Ligand binder design. Structure first.
Ligand SMILES: CC(=O)SCCNC(=O)CCNC(=O)[C@H](O)C(C)(C)COP(=O)(O)OP(=O)(O)OC[C@H]1O[C@@H](n2cnc3c(N)ncnc32)[C@H](O)[C@@H]1OP(=O)(O)O
Ligand SMILES: CC(=O)SCCNC(=O)CCNC(=O)[C@H](O)C(C)(C)COP(=O)(O)OP(=O)(O)OC[C@H]1O[C@@H](n2cnc3c(N)ncnc32)[C@H](O)[C@@H]1OP(=O)(O)O
Lengths: 390, 239, 390
């Protein structure tokens, strides 16, 4: 049974990923990319009324230029969502989108809204991550400036838990492999929303796949790569790290009570939400603290969750997490079965709900029940969520 | 007056506040030679006894503030046995440390160039006011060495590990603007107004407006960084 | 009585406002300004342990440079708040900080945390509002580009409800007057946190007042001013509009049950939270839709609220709201008695909880019970909150 106050996820949608460098989104604004996605996901669910949408909580990080001035509203205005609805842009770096899901879910449980539209976007191609960055000198008085560089925070964990190059590249090939496999075997069809884009020559066509996925990825092809952050002694390379990708992700969320009224079959039900912090120098260890506080608030154990979706930031950060989660030996059985961020890219603002949505599909596609959506966050942070299939 | 040497003059002022000016008569600039180190020693022990003192303002009579000691004396000093050398700095740092532990607000009025020991002198004080047309830095590495007068001790705890590592490993001069941003200086003002800038600051420290005891504490204790944060803060710096 | 699940506001704090142009904060980073405020507010409440702080939800709008990359965490790291705590930066333009309060409050009601630290900051001096703004052409296909200019959206409402110049300037003087009055008579003493700054000559001294307040403001001095947005026919000027000000605002919030455990006397208790949307062209009419949805969610009427705090965006937007709220003839009795945004400035990210915090004091200072904190938001939005003194 489901209490009227519980949270329900109606549908999930995500734009086809694409290389930020001369990719399919080279000429698409992050605003239009979001508004377009939101509008499309609302069409597949003609039962829910755009007017009932209390608030649109979008996820974004580098909020400036295209992504500035509350992009959550700048996008909701170019959709069927009335001007009567609200819109806020939540930012928590990588876990931005996921935090948005929580803000809405919690907004529902407290009787402050019945229907919400959550998601996130991040067009790194236009609004690059290195644009407009003014380091704070005083930050060095309380922490290490180096802790700011995500690449180095991955190196430290790769040395603390002993993760070799032969292991990191092995996890990378797995991501590309499984990602391509799921793609070809049609598994992303229910979530990928056909979107117009441009190819090399500049021709207009619709993409429904993921450019970021490189099938020709092998242990040998990655071994030929050189350390991208630490010259002498580095283990993490551009091949083991996630990719700079333009893309969004939407998700219709509402109360269970309203679900029993609109007669629409759910996709999952949120059970526990959690966020935690760790040392900035080793932010890659954020998932574990978040997962624990999540399972506890759900009265469960790591053994109760059938499928797990861990955002693949770096190969030197994912493995350590899965190892201390006592599920490493269960990787190929319940962890990123359709692919990871290493092959699907990591849009700072979209990744949040992106992996959470994909998780729901992995469960529905394999008769799973409990799912785990966790990810590490820059400057020492972590966030997790547990969805139940019922 | 309270004190009077050939390179340092400690003149009394209003409200008990007393000024300690570095003016090496005869020469063009100021530097920590054998004489200045001894006179500053006496100056400190003098202020350490005078009970009418309510504050100390360190100024400069020459154009530049205080530059490194004579390069000639460096060589002469780098020939002595290691044991005798360390004793020279062990007793040297004591002088600055005494001016630091002085139970009274202290501020440095950087009117001009303050390099090497000059900056280390200011680092010993509590507050620091600098003229927009001045420059400060620690060009010790330009000789194969690093700050020996508490530089590698007070700077890292005052402006942060990273920023300190940079200021030291490069030995580059720093403009007024940058000096303030890293908090190596507490305030920048025009040359002419630099005078009242120090006086006004002192009174705002004596009254209790500016807790000088709390601002001096940081460089008398362990770094604020985490153990894990340190591992990265230094290793990355080294690499 | 108070149920353990209700929300409690322990303490409120705010930095001394200051002109963005050559003001007291000309040399203070928005990051350090926040971290310094948060740290100080936690000192006055030595009973609450910084470690128990589940999450720090800060408010910010133009998140770039200094305010970019999740400033909420960049500030929480330079405080006594452990790395174990989380931090997110919520953006909803003007109502950013206020939305932060809701996220935390709702996070408490749902058992997703016990102690939170909310607030917001906006250093318009460094990160000006016109910095890095890339207008979206497609927006004109669904709305009016002019609606983006906050000044013009004020003109429209000034014509729709018939607000003359002689009225707008009259409301402006009122703000400066009451603000200066409350200041001199010591009414902001409990909220203003002494902060170091610099004067004209560049001297270092501590400010405890508000520079933005110009006591010499009269109906004559304002009448001498010329329209700032619409030349021929304009009514709104820089004098009737809010000020560009650097400043932050902090607020310690936790559960009621935890309050009964730490034995700390509350300041107010959140009863209802609400957000709504209006037409971008007339975003100044956002407060009414928000207040209504708020009072209803609290089972109250506009007559039950003893004191009201309406962020004075423009004189041409505040009056219309108070008129349609049926409390215009009750202004001098329960509306911005300590001053408004026209004299205290409007930091896009701080104004949210700033006005709400001031509201709590106005209630405690005059034996009030129910308070109303509402404000209009750009691009057609509104947000309100109702606090109870008990
Ligand atoms: C905390 C969290 O959740 S996530 C933190 C966020 N971090 C990230 O997203 C990672 C950051 N990474 C980056 O910014 C960039 O990737 C950098 C800076 C590390 C490297 O960028 P660059 O200096 O431009 O090098 P670049 O990325 O172009 O290198 C890629 C090269 O590897 C090759 N390559 C990549 N994958 C493969 C593969 N599977 N097999 C073979 N070759 C490969 C490419 O062909 C390319 O070679 P080319 O340049 O000759 O064409
Ligand atoms: C939806 C919400 O909640 S908030 C909406 C956001 N609000 C806004 O965007 C409006 C904020 N205001 C501003 O950004 C600016 O003041 C603007 C754009 C209106 C005008 O900027 P500028 O072109 O620089 O003119 P400026 O602000 O300097 O003022 C011009 C003159 O008016 C004077 N003036 C301004 N306010 C007052 C006042 N209250 N009393 C007397 N004189 C005043 C100034 O002193 C100045 O005089 P000077 O020329 O002799 O120096």
């Amino acid at each position: 049974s489901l209490n009227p106050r519980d949270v329900v996820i109606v549908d999930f949608g995500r734009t086809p990923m694409g290389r930020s460098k001369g990719g399919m989104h080279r000429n698409t604004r992050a605003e239009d990319m979001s508004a377009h996605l939101i509008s499309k996901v609302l069409e597949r669910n003609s039962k829910v009324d755009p007017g009932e949408v209390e608030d649109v909580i979008w996820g974004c990080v580098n909020q400036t230029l295209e992504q500035g001035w509350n992009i959550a509203r700048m996008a909701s205005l170019m959709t069927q969502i009335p001007h009567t609805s609200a819109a806020q842009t939540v930012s928590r770096l990588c876990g931005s989108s996921m935090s948005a899901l929580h803000t809405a879910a919690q907004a529902i449980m407290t009787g402050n809204g019945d229907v919400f539209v959550v998601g996130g976007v991040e067009h790194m191609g236009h609004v690059s991550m290195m644009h407009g960055v003014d380091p704070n000198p005083h930050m060095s008085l309380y922490a290490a400036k180096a802790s700011g560089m995500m690449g180095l925070t991955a190196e430290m964990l790769g040395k603390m838990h002993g993760i070799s190059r032969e292991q990191q590249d092995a996890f990378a090939v797995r991501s590309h492999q499984l990602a391509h496999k799921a793609t070809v075997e049609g598994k992303f069809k229910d979530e990928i929303i056909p979107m117009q884009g441009y190819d090399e020559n500049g021709f207009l066509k619709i993409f429904d796949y993921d450019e970021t996925i490189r099938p020709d990825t092998t242990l040998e092809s990655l071994a030929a790569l050189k350390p991208a952050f630490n010259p002498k002694g580095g283990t993490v390379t551009a091949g083991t790290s996630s990719q700079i990708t333009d893309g969004a992700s939407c998700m219709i969320v509402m109360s269970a009570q309203r679900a029993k009224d609109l007669g629409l079959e759910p996709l999952a039900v949120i059970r526990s939400m959690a966020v935690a912090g760790v040392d900035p120098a080793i932010m890659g260890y954020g998932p574990v603290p978040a997962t624990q506080k999540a399972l506890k608030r759900a009265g469960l154990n790591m053994a109760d969750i059938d499928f797990i979706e861990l955002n693949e930031a770096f190969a030197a950060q994912a493995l350590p997490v899965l190892k201390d989660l006592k599920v490493l030996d269960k990787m190929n059985e319940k962890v990123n079965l359709h692919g990871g961020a290493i092959a699907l890219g990591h849009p700072f603002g979209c990744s949040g709900a992106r992996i959470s949505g994909t998780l729901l599909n992995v469960m529905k596609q394999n008769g799973g029940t409990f799912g785990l959506s966790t990810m590490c966050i820059g400057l020492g942070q972590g966030i997790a969520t547990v969805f139940e299939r019922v | 007056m309270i004190y009077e040497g050939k390179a340092i003059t400690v003149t009394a002022l209003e409200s008990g506040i007393v000024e300690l000016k570095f003016d090496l008569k005869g020469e063009s600039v100021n530097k920590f030679n054998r004489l200045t180190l001894n006179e500053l020693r006496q100056a400190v022990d003098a202020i350490k006894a005078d009970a009418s003192v309510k504050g100390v303002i360190v100024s400069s009579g020459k154009d530049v503030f205080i530059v490194g000691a004579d390069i000639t004396e460096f060589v002469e000093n780098f020939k002595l046995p290691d044991a005798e050398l360390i004793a020279g700095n062990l007793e040297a740092n004591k002088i600055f440390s005494d001016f630091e532990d002085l139970n009274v607000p202290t501020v440095a009025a950087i009117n001009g160039i303050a390099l090497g020991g000059g900056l280390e002198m200011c680092l010993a004080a509590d507050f620091r006011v600098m003229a927009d047309s001045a420059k400060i830095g620690l060009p010790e590495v330009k000789l194969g060495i690093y700050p020996g007068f508490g530089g590698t001790v007070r700077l890292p705890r005052l402006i942060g590990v990273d920023n300190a590592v940079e200021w030291i490993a490069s030995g580059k001069e720093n403009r007024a603007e940058d000096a303030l941003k890293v908090s190596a200086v507490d305030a920048v003002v025009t040359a002419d107004k630099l005078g009242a800038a120090a006086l006004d600051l002192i009174k705002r420290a004596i009254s209790g407006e500016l807790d000088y005891k709390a601002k001096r504490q940081p460089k008398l204790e362990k770094l604020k960084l985490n153990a894990i944060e340190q591992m990265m803060a230094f290793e990355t710096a080294k690499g």
